[PDB]
Subunit: 280 residues, 4 copies
C-alpha cells in the first residue's frame, strides 16, 4: 500500500533535503527511506517508500518534483502501489531459468506479469503454453539478423514490456538491439574459470578441481556478457560432483542469481552508477 520514489543526481549538499522537504510539503508519509552517496563516482542515490495522502495529485506531484530536481540535475522514477512490471522472457533450449522465473511469478514471489516468451527455437513452446503465456518462435536466417530482431522488438513494443529477461537466450544481440534495451534487459551467465573460452567450461572446472561454481546477472550493454553487474552468487560443489553434476549446480546458481537480480529490479532497488550498480 506504498508508493516507491527513486532519485539520482550529481553529489552535492542538499540532495536528501530536496527529496525529503518536497515529500513533507506534499503530505507524503515516509514509511522507509534509504540513500547512498558514492564518493568515487560522485553520484547520489535514494529510495523512498511512502503512503499517499487522500486526494493525491500524481501529475502535479511529478511536475513539482521535476521543477525542484532541475537545480540538482536530478532524475527520478515514481511507482504506484500495485505496480506489476510487464516482462518478456527470452529463451533458447535451456528451460531452467524460464521454469524458475515462472514458478516464482506464480507463487507471488516476483510481482511481475510475464506477457510473452520469445525464442529463436520452437522447443519451449509447450512449457510456455502450459503456463498460458503467449509464445513466439522467431527463427534466425543468418543472412538477415536485423529481421529476426525486428520481430523480437515488435513483441516487446506490442506487449508494453518494461523489462526483458534473457533466461539463457543464446543468440547474440546486435549492438543496435543492445542500445535499444539499455538499462532494462537483464542477462544471466555462469562465472566458471574467468578467462577460459573453451566449449566445455564445466569439464574444465571439474579437471581443475574447483569447490564452487558461480553466476553473474547483469544489465545488457555493448560488451558481451559484461556490462553492469547486478548480482553474483556461488554454489558449493565437491569431488563427488562429476561434470553433469557441476553443470546441474551451475543451473541452480544461474536460477537463483537471476531471480535475485530480477527481484531487485522490479522492487525498484537497482540504480546504474557509472558502469556498476548500487542496490538499495
Amino acid at each position: 500500500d506504498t508508493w516507491i520514489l527513486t532519485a539520482d543526481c550529481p553529489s552535492m549538499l542538499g540532495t536528501v533535503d530536496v527529496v525529503t522537504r518536497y515529500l513533507f510539503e506534499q503530505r507524503c508519509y515516509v514509511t522507509e527511506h534509504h540513500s547512498f552517496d558514492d564518493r568515487q563516482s560522485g553520484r547520489f542515490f535514494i529510495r523512498v517508500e511512502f503512503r499517499q495522502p487522500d486526494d493525491f495529485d500524481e501529475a502535479g506531484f511529478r511536475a513539482g518534483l521535476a521543477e525542484r530536481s532541475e537545480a540538482f540535475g536530478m532524475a527520478f522514477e515514481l511507482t504506484a502501489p500495485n505496480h506489476r512490471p510487464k516482462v518478456v522472457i527470452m529463451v533458447s533450449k535451456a528451460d531452467h531459468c524460464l521454469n524458475d522465473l515462472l514458478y516464482r511469478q506464480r507463487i507471488g514471489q516476483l510481482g511481475m506479469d510475464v506477457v510473452a516468451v520469445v525464442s529463436n527455437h520452437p522447443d519451449l513452446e509447450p512449457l510456455a503454453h502450459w503456463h498460458k503465456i503467449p509464445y513466439y518462435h522467431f527463427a534466425l536466417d543468418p543472412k538477415d539478423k536485423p529481421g529476426q530482431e525486428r520481430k523480437v522488438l515488435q513483441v516487446i513494443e506490442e506487449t508494453g514490456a518494461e523489462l526483458v529477461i534473457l533466461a539463457r537466450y543464446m543468440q547474440v544481440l546486435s549492438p543496435e538491439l543492445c542500445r535499444r534495451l539499455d538499462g532494462w534487459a537483464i542477462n544471466i551467465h555462469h562465472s566458471l574459470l574467468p578467462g577460459f573460452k573453451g566449449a566445455k567450461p564445466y569439464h574444465q572446472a571439474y579437471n581443475k578441481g574447483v569447490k564452487m561454481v558461480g553466476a553473474t546477472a547483469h544489465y545488457i550493454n555493448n560488451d558481451l556478457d559484461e556490462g553492469p553487474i547486478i548480482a553474483q552468487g556461488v554454489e558449493v560443489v565437491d569431488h563427488s560432483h562429476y561434470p553433469e553434476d557441476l553443470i546441474a549446480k551451475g543451473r541452480d546458481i544461474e536460477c537463483l542469481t537471476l531471480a535475485r537480480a530480477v527481484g531487485y529490479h522490479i522492487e525498484r532497488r537497482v540504480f546504474l552508477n557509472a558502469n556498476r550498480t548500487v542496490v538499495l
Copy 2:
C-alpha cells in the same frame, strides 16, 4: 572520517525533514541515510553518516538539534569519527566468549576498548592479564548480593564504560542493577529446540539438527528482554553431547560478536520490547 547521528522519535509527518533539513542548514554533508517507520509501535528510527564541515561547532550543533527535537519528543545520539566505546566484560568460568571478543578487538574488527574484565570467580585472571587488561574478582557472599553488585557498578563507573558485555556471566543480576544497565548491557545465551539439568544432552537425545544462540539487552526478565541477534549452527547425528556443547560455544561467540558490533556501530535501537537494527 564520518560522524554518526541516530534519532528515535514518535511517528509523525515530517520526522525525516526535522533531521535532514537541520543537517542541510548545518552544512553537514550526508554520505548515507537509513530509516524505518514501525507502523505497529508508532516509532520512527533514523541513522545518518555525515562528513563534518570546516570549523564544526559541535556544541552549537547538539544545542540546535535539542531545540528542534523538543517539538517532536525526539531522542538523538551523536558519535564522533574516532569514537571507541569503553567496555566492561563480565565473565564467570567459560572463556569462549571472552576469548572471541578480545581477539576481535585486537585485530580491529570490533572498534572498542576493553577497560576491565570483572568476574565472580578468580579462574580467568591469567587470560585477562595475558591481554594486559585489568581484572577484578568480586566474590559473592550469598547474604550480601547488593555488596558484590556495588563493587561491580563502581568499576563500571570509575572506568567510565558505556557498554557492559555479559560473556557467560552466570550470577543473576538483581532488579536494581538490571534497571541501571537497561539499554547498554548485552547478554548471550543458548537457544535449542528443553529446560533442566543438561540441555545439550536433551538436544542430543531429541535428535536436533541445529543449535542456536540469542544475544539481547538486559532487563528484569531472565534471559529474555530485548533481542538484538540470533543465529544457529548446523549439527547432525555424529555430534555427541560434548560436540553439541562445542558447537553451542561457537554460535554464542558469533552471535554475541555480531550484536556487540551492531551496538558499537550505533545501529541498534530500542523499540518497545524489541530492537530495530539499521
Copy 3:
C-alpha cells in the same frame, strides 16, 4: 546407474565387514560407501552404492544377504538404479508446500512420482488438475473419523504409494493411522516459539522480536508434531518483517525444510535410530 544398499543392526565388531565382504564375493563394484556407529544408541548404520555385474542375480543376492545378516540381527533394504518412489501428498488449504514439491518433482530435483493428492477440502483440486495428478476430496464427518481415514488409506493402498507427505494437512491423524504410516509419512510444521500454543504464533514472534523463523520436518508417530526429526532450518527475518511477512518467511522455510527431508528419504539416506534419525 547404481544400486543403493542400506543396512542397520546392533553394534558389534565386523558390521562393516559382513556387508563389504558379501559385496566383494557378489562382484558388486562399490562406487561409494558411508557408515556410522552410534556409541550411545548401540546401533550401526551403513549406506552403500554399487554398480551391478552382468547377469545380476537379485533374488539370490537378497537371500544370501538375509542369510549372513541373521548373526548380526541386521535389517537391510536394496533399491534398484532407476527407482522412483510413488508418493501421495496430503493437503488442506495451504498450497505452498504442494507447489514446492510438485515444482521440484517436475524439474527433476526430486526423483519421485506423485500418484495422488489427497485432501480434506476441495480447494486445491485445480492445482492438482493442472499438474494432471489425480485429486481426492474426502470431507470429514466429525462423528465418523475412521470413515474419512479409510478412504485416505484406500487411495494410498490402491496407488501403491510408498511415501506419504503431509504438506500442511491440518486434520489430526488418529493413533490408528499414525501406527499404520509409521516410518514412511513425513510431516512439516513451523518451529517458531517452542511451547507457545496460541492461535497466532507469528504475531507472537513479531511482538517478541525474533530475528529468525524456523521449521521441522519429521516422521509421523503417536506424539503429535514430535516424533523423529529428519531436518530443521531457519530463515533470517528482521524488524521490517510484519506478521504477514513473517508468516510468508515461515512458508519459505517450511517449503525448503520439507523438500530437503523428502530428498533425504527418497535417496535412501535416512535411518531411524531409537527416537531420532541418522542421515548418511
Copy 4:
C-alpha cells in the same frame, strides 16, 4: 580416543574389502567410515576411524597392512589418537592469517602445535613472541635464493614439522623447494570475478563485483595454482570502497585457509591427480 586410517589405491573390485577385512581380523572396532571411488581418475579413497583393541600391536598392524597393500598398490597413513601435527607458519608483513591461525590453535579448534614462525622480514617478531613461539627472520640476498631457502628448510627439519602453512608469505618459492614440500605445504591467496596486475581490489571495486573470494591450495611449481583444497567467498556491495574490499579479502583468506588447514590436520584431504578429495 580413535585412530585414523586413510588409504588410497587404484580402483578395483575389493579395495574396500582389503582394508575392512584387515581391520576386522585385527579386532579394530570401526566407529566411522567414508569412501569415494573416482571413476574419472581411477582412484579409490577411504578414511576410517576406529577404536584400538587392548594391547594394540602398532608395528604388527602397520606391517600386516603393508603386506596386504602390496597387491593393491595402496598407500596408507595411520594417525594415533592424540596426534598433533607440528607446523611451521611462514609470513611476510600481513598478519591477518597468522593471527587467525594462532587464535584457532590457542582455543583448541586447530589441533596442531606451531613449532616455528619463519619470515623474510622482522616485522611480525613481536606477534610470534607474544604467543611464545620461536620466530626466525631470514632476509633475502637476491643473488643467493638457495641460501635463504636453505635456512628456511633447516628450521622445518630441525623442528620436525609435518606441515608448512604459507600465511601470505610473499617470497616466490623455487622449483626445488616447491618439489620438496609437495603435499604438505598449504598456501592462501585471493580469487576475484580475474584481474591482472596492479591493485586487484581497486579493479574489483571499479568493476562492481558483489563478492570477494579466496583459494587455499597445496604448493607445486605453478605459482598460486596447484591442488585446490578449499574455496570460499564473502558478500560485498556498492558501499564497500577499495579498502573495505581489502578488509573483506582478508576475512575470506582467513576463513578459507583455516578450513583447509583443518581438513588437512584431520586427515581428510587426499591428492587426486591435480585435485583434492576431501572426506
